[PDB]
Nucleic acid binder design. Structure first.
Ligand SMILES: [Mg+2]
Ligand SMILES: [Mg+2]
Ligand SMILES: [Mg+2]
Ligand SMILES: [Mg+2]
Ligand SMILES: [Mg+2]
Ligand SMILES: [Mg+2]
Ligand SMILES: [Mg+2]
Ligand SMILES: [Mg+2]
Ligand SMILES: [Mg+2]
Ligand SMILES: [Mg+2]
Ligand SMILES: [Mg+2]
Ligand SMILES: [Mg+2]
Ligand SMILES: [Mg+2]
Ligand SMILES: [Mg+2]
Ligand SMILES: [Mg+2]
Ligand SMILES: [Mg+2]
Ligand SMILES: [Mg+2]
Ligand SMILES: [Mg+2]
Ligand SMILES: [Mg+2]
Ligand SMILES: [Mg+2]
Ligand SMILES: [Mg+2]
Ligand SMILES: [Mg+2]
Ligand SMILES: [Mg+2]
Ligand SMILES: [Mg+2]
Ligand SMILES: [Mg+2]
Ligand SMILES: [Mg+2]
Ligand SMILES: [Mg+2]
Ligand SMILES: [Mg+2]
Ligand SMILES: [Mg+2]
Ligand SMILES: [Mg+2]
Ligand SMILES: [Mg+2]
Ligand SMILES: [Mg+2]
Ligand SMILES: [Mg+2]
Ligand SMILES: [Mg+2]
Ligand SMILES: [Mg+2]
Ligand SMILES: [Mg+2]
Ligand SMILES: [Mg+2]
Ligand SMILES: [Mg+2]
Ligand SMILES: [Mg+2]
Ligand SMILES: [Mg+2]
Ligand SMILES: [Mg+2]
Ligand SMILES: [Mg+2]
Lengths: 247, 230, 56, 121, 68
RNA sequence: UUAUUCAAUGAAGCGGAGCUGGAAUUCAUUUUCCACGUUCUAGCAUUCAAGGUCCCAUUCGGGGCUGAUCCGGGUUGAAG
RNA sequence: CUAAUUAAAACAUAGCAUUGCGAUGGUCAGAAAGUGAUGUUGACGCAAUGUGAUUUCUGCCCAGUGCUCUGAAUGUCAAA
RNA sequence: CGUGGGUUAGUCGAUCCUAAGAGAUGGGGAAGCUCCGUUUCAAAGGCCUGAUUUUAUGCAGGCCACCAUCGAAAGGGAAUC
């Protein structure tokens, strides 16, 4: 009869993300006239490390088109992007790794990253390290582009949505064992409080639906309805199937 | 001058920071400005039932200039001349002693909504000017129908401010003539003949026509663009 | 320390070159050379683009 | 239909004229007198033996002063209550909650002479 | 005078004219603050019969409350 | 689409018309279209902009216009 | 780690595996909201679980119960 | 226990700055006590004139698109031996 650990996560007190050492939000440049009609040249100044993020972050300086000053945009660095490299962003930009282009102005089978779902949301898709979006189709009439997502999902998005050529740098990061609890400790120390995880079968019945009993066991099906309520969704929620991928 | 030289700046994309241009189309206006422009927009976007927007069919500048030229010969008394003729009437009560009546009959425009509606209902108004800018419009919306039923000629005219100018108010919302002097019968007869031509002899057809349904600039452009495409 | 710089004279805070107390005499040399060869490349690009647009 | 050329897309609130106040009636009808004059600033001398040593040797007059009085007010009140020059004023709040000023006089003045003019030691 | 006409015309709410006026006005008041000052009564005859006089000392405020 | 909804921005360039060139083989008509000044390089880009043109009533300086095309005042997009 | 009777074989752990979710979304807050946590996030990610380093293996059973499925649309069916 | 005496700062600290965070306003919610929110969907703003006699300097141009405030006697910080 006690509020369980996943229900306490939404109150956001000790389960907030640890955001002191992060460099800022990584976004694309704002979709302005220069990117909508031509291109703009920025410069990679630093490739830095973002805390909690597996991917390195490029700091790219553009000239402000309407005032005399410099705008520093924070990009997710694509693999091969180097300091001092010019980055071109706009409809008329070229097919180079690091360049920011609308997806309608881009051929088929092109690998892109930091892809807007809607034109002007400044980067939504394929942002984690090593991830990319394949362009798998164009529907020029009532402009739409079919893309393939890193989960394998096909998705039709707008041709005016912008992506960045290349894959996200930092790939292969989950290819290393952590080997030890301290490396997971320092990994999650700058993400958020979600580790270590006590199992619900190891708790009392007051703490979890899986809690209690004279042996640690579940006792009802771990598969939970989508139409179940908070406190009940502790297991394999709305599972179409279970078990190993074996035919 | 050989010391001067021509630079010319390249205000393209990606070169030579843009000059000061007119950005008045892009101004984030205050909310009262935005809502008063968008109210005007919405009231003509929607289909307008024919009872309202028989307004904006207005007495145009020429016949309205003639109408105000006649109506400004019948301006009501200011406070100054009322104070003058009250002292003159007090002197008349002192020595003249007709009854109380040294003052003549006054010939003034009739204003005030209840008063002019009473005059129309008693068939005393010879001409009713109705402001087209009255808000709420429900105050004056029944007046073409009541004027038409009583046979009073009405003109919908621009300016509750402008009617207020001749009745010495700020806003008047109506003005009426119920009797004019001997010199102005011909002018009132010409004005009634053109005003009934514009308003009361068109009223049967104007009762049927819905107003509004006006597309915007871009919606009219893409409305005729796909007409060309078809 | 940063507020001690308001007490010393301009000489201690500056080198007598362009970008004196900001850049490091090799980055200054690099940016002079980069400037000059890029305007020379700009006028070569201008003449070449004018020739290929006036010839075809 | 000429319209103002706006080179900015931000509307700001216009700088309207501000009138100063011009009241029909006075706010409190009598200005208060000096709430900390010199007779308020200086309460009394301190005649502890430790203070008398400072008078006889260091040329410091030791006073109990008002709790509201800063070192400027102590210096001004000493300067026109005893007609002396003040080199320095040092001040402490005592543990019994009253203020004490060690007023060091300029070497043109003898604190022993001034203290015997006042009436203590 | 005109207040009797206003009285009888306010009861025809699902007429075309009051439906148009209702829609333009419900957009207008929703674009304002939840409580705001009205410069004048939009139902002046209802204000007469509820006690408002048009003189200095009487104030109209328009207010919107959530339903349900 | 105008209510409602979502989104973004220092609400900056939206929409519609406007010079040429042509693989429109000018068919004597923009039934008809595209391109709107920037890609070797970790430089630089700000003073209502120089230029050109017109007026001040000239005062060692100032004001227009064009440079920088008009028109609609729908900030722009999505959704309905 | 059971402060003050249980320091363990219990819990955690790396490793393994399963599940949900491509954002007007998953999971979770809040009486409501023009409100929130994850989220300065985007599937090498977040969220929910189980098992518990390495080695070697993980057999059979979809009847029951749960979960799930553009699945059948005159079986049942409320308000209007 | 009774009676007094004693704490002196331009330089040591606080004061100031921001931190995790707390929190007004604008605005929305809530029967309401109050809740949310912290730059948001607000008409949110005060600074020098290049140096002086028609100037309590302004009734001159001109610039800034920032947005309460609180929050560390171990963090940052003007200066004494
Ligand atoms: Mg509890
Ligand atoms: Mg609880
Ligand atoms: Mg949990
Ligand atoms: Mg946070
Ligand atoms: Mg964790
Ligand atoms: Mg685990
Ligand atoms: Mg576990
Ligand atoms: Mg237990
Ligand atoms: Mg137990
Ligand atoms: Mg339970
Ligand atoms: Mg159990
Ligand atoms: Mg077990
Ligand atoms: Mg279930
Ligand atoms: Mg307002
Ligand atoms: Mg006053
Ligand atoms: Mg002190
Ligand atoms: Mg009454
Ligand atoms: Mg009033
Ligand atoms: Mg509508
Ligand atoms: Mg815009
Ligand atoms: Mg205990
Ligand atoms: Mg114990
Ligand atoms: Mg133990
Ligand atoms: Mg023990
Ligand atoms: Mg246990
Ligand atoms: Mg957050
Ligand atoms: Mg264990
Ligand atoms: Mg084992
Ligand atoms: Mg089974
Ligand atoms: Mg039924
Ligand atoms: Mg004692
Ligand atoms: Mg004692
Ligand atoms: Mg100090
Ligand atoms: Mg602060
Ligand atoms: Mg609060
Ligand atoms: Mg509210
Ligand atoms: Mg406080
Ligand atoms: Mg503070
Ligand atoms: Mg400190
Ligand atoms: Mg530090
Ligand atoms: Mg410190
Ligand atoms: Mg300090």
């Amino acid at each position: 009869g006690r509020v369980i650990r996943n229900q306490r996560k939404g109150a956001g007190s000790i389960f907030t993300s640890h955001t002191r050492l992060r460099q800022g939000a990584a976004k694309l440049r704002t979709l302005d006239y220069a990117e909508r009609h031509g291109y703009i040249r920025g410069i990679v100044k630093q490739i830095v490390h973002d805390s909690g993020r597996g991917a390195p972050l490029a700091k790219v300086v553009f000239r402000d088109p309407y005032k005399y000053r410099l705008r520093e945009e924070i990009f997710i660095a694509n693999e091969g992007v180097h300091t001092g490299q010019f980055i071109y962003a706009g409809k008329k930009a070229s097919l180079n790794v690091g360049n920011v282009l609308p997806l309608g102005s881009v051929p088929e089978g092109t690998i892109v990253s930091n892809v807007e779902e809607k034109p002007g949301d400044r980067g939504a898709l394929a942002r984690a390290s090593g991830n990319y979006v394949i362009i798998i189709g164009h529907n020029p009439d009532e402009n739409k582009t079919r893309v393939r997502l890193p989960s394998g999902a096909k998705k039709v998005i707008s041709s005016d949505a912008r992506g960045v050529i290349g894959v996200i740098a930092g790939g292969g990061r989950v290819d290393k064992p952590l080997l030890k609890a301290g490396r997971a400790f320092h990994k999650y120390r700058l993400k958020r409080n979600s580790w270590p995880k006590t199992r619900g079968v190891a708790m009392n019945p007051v703490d979890h639906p899986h809690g209690g009993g004279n042996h640690q066991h579940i006792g009802k099906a771990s598969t939970i309805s989508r139409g179940a309520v908070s406190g009940q969704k502790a297991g394999l929620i709305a599972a179409r199937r279970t078990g190993l991928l074996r035919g | 001058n050989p010391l001067t030289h021509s630079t010319p700046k390249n205000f393209g994309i990606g070169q030579a920071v843009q000059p000061k241009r007119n950005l008045s189309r892009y101004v984030k206006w205050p909310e009262y400005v935005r809502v008063q422009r968008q109210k005007k927009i919405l009231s003509i976007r929607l289909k307008v039932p024919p009872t309202i927007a028989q307004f904006q069919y207005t007495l145009d500048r020429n016949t309205a200039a003639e109408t105000f030229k006649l109506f400004n010969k019948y301006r009501p008394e200011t406070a100054a001349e009322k104070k003058e003729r009250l002292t003159k009437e007090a002197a008349a009560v002192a020595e003249g002693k007709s009854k109380q009546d040294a003052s003549p009959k006054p010939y003034a425009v009739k204003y005030g909504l209840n008063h002019v509606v009473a005059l129309i209902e008693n068939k005393k108004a010879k001409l009713v000017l109705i402001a087209n800018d009255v808000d709420p419009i429900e105050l004056v919306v029944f007046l073409p129908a009541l004027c038409k039923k009583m046979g009073v000629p009405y003109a919908i005219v621009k300016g509750k401010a402008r009617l207020g100018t001749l009745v010495n108010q700020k806003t008047s919302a109506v003005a009426a003539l119920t009797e004019v002097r001997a010199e102005d019968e011909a002018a009132l007869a010409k004005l009634v003949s053109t005003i009934d031509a514009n308003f009361a002899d068109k009223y049967d057809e104007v009762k049927k026509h819905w107003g509004g349904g006006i597309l915007g600039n871009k919606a009219q452009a893409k409305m005729d663009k796909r007409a060309k495409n078809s | 320390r940063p507020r001690q710089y308001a007490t010393v004279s301009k000489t201690h805070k500056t080198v007598s070159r362009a970008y004196g107390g900001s850049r490091c005499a090799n980055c200054v040399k690099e940016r002079i050379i980069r400037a000059f060869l890029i305007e020379e490349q700009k006028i070569v690009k201008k003449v070449v683009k004018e020739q290929t647009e006036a010839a075809k | 239909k000429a319209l103002k050329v706006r080179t900015s897309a931000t509307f700001r609130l216009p700088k309207t004229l501000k009138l100063a106040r011009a009241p029909k009636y006075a706010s409190k009808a009598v200005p208060h007198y000096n709430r900390l004059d010199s007779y308020k600033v200086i309460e009394q001398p301190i005649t502890s033996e430790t203070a008398m040593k400072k008078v006889e040797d260091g040329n410091i007059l030791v006073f109990q002063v008002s709790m509201k009085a800063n070192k400027y007010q102590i210096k001004k009140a000493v300067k026109e209550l005893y007609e002396v020059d003040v080199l320095k004023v040092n001040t402490l709040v005592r543990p019994n909650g009253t203020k004490k000023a060690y007023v060091r006089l300029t070497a043109d003045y003898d604190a022993l002479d001034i203290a015997n003019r006042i009436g203590y030691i | 005078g005109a207040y009797k006409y206003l009285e009888e015309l306010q009861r025809k709410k699902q007429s075309d004219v009051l439906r148009f006026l209702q829609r333009v006005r419900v957009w207008e008041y929703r674009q304002k603050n939840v409580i705001h000052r009205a410069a004048r009564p939009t139902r002046p005859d209802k204000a007469r019969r509820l006690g408002y006089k048009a003189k200095q000392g009487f104030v109209i405020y328009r207010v919107r409350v959530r339903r349900g």
